[PDB]
Design a protein around this ligand. Structure first.
Ligand code: FES
Ligand code: FES
Lengths: 65, 65
């Protein structure tokens, strides 16, 4: 079973790299590959977990203050 | 139909991680495949997953400019 079904299949290995100085107060990253705003989390994980019995969720990067 | 996460912290109904930028060193490499033994960090387990399944997933990198 593949994890990613539909995102950038012309790319043989999908990596995103961001500079933390370019981030705002908060960025929420998708780890389920179901987001329509990938690499960002759009809440699609909830549907995925419900349908499959899985327990996956996002990665949050934030400023302490 | 298929779960993405097979084995990681299955007693947690939704696995979410949250980090403050200030505690990140120069580079953090986060796993998006749910196969790393250092989860939430990437340990290169994605390469085997991709080879085994024909998938194209890889990590999220947060770094200093
Ligand atoms: S949409 Fe994928 S983790 Fe939230
Ligand atoms: S080990 Fe999972 S993305 Fe690298």
């Amino acid at each position: 079973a593949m994890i990613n079904l539909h995102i950038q299949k012309d790319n043989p290995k999908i990596v995103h790299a961001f500079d933390m100085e370019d981030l705002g107060d908060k960025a929420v990253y998708c780890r389920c590959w179901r987001s329509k705003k990938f690499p960002f989390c759009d809440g699609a994980h909830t549907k995925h977990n419900e349908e499959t019995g899985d327990n996956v969720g996002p990665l949050i990067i934030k400023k302490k203050e």
